[PDB]
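User: Predict lysozyme's structure from this.
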Amino acid sequence: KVFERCELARTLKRLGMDGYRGISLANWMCLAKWESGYNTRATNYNAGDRSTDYGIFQINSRYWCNDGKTPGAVNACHLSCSALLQDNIADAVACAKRVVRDPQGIRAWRAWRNRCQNRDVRQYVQGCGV
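Assistant:
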């Protein structure tokens, strides 16, 4: 499904994302915005290393979820990459939380650095009631 902005913000808040490991809701919104445009169905194949990015946060198969076809891959979130394609984002959120429990935190996503880091991200949550 393709979430509407404020709908996603309240959904993420309800799932305990606001301030998770010091990361604000607006940052998660900015990440979801640039990674998939709030699309839970989004998939991006990386011909370069035979891995695939899944769901609203575009989590990679080489390290986080198992899709069985990625060479030399691990499954740190301990989920099928299929769980990262559901309309219900609870599993995707549990996995995003796992990603940020590592040293880099939100910096694990290259796009967050390019599109969200050191930027005014207030607009992502304005008017949403979060």
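Residues 65 and 75 are 4 Å apart (CA to CA).
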